[PDB]
């Protein structure tokens, strides 16, 4: 109820079938270019990659999904810090902040408010949204495996 939100989140899977290096990049509102999912996971407070693969894929026995996660773990290796991820999303989209100290906190406020308007919009719900995001990635890759 209220405001009538129109913002829509999109998680895109690049690379056709057969070719290698099939990375995953999800778009964010108010941010121009697309951002990889792992970098967003770094911006949500989750730094290690084993926890990321633990949130995306819920079955350790399956090797296919984890195998397709590898390139995203490589680009997620390029950017390894949460602060560098907040500065990365701060430098990627929305250039009206000018100052960096206000664009990192402004980007964090974007991740706490505009990012996923449903559930809630308060501060501290980043773990929950991380689990939901890993669920959406699990549905995307699970749909890519022809299952």
């Amino acid at each position: 109820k209220g405001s009538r939100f129109i913002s829509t989140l999109q998680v895109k899977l690049y690379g056709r079938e057969g070719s290698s290096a099939r990375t995953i990049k999800a778009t964010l509102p108010y941010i121009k270019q697309d951002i990889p999912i792992v970098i967003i996971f770094r911006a949500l407070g989750i730094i290690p990659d084993g926890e990321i693969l633990e949130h995306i894929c819920y079955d350790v026995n399956d090797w296919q999904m984890l195998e397709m996660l590898k390139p995203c773990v490589e680009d997620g290796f390029v950017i390894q810090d949460r602060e560098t991820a907040l500065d990365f999303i701060g430098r990627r989209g929305t250039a009206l902040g000018i100052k960096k100290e206000k664009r990192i906190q402004y980007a964090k406020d974007i991740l706490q408010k505009e990012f996923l308007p449903h559930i809630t919009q308060l501060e501290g719900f980043e773990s929950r949204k991380a689990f939901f995001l890993g669920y959406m990635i699990n549905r995307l890759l699970l749909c890519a495996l022809d299952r």
Partner: protein
Amino acid sequence: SLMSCISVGTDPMPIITFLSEWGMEPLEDYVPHQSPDATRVFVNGVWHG
């Protein structure tokens, strides 16, 4: 069709409040390695636990 009606919408808060009284673990406490066979609960698309 002659017996088809349109819903009007209720309140999901009493249901979410009623679920946590029977051991519904919140989402932020979830570990897939400690509870792999746990059934996910969804209320209007929101994953509460």
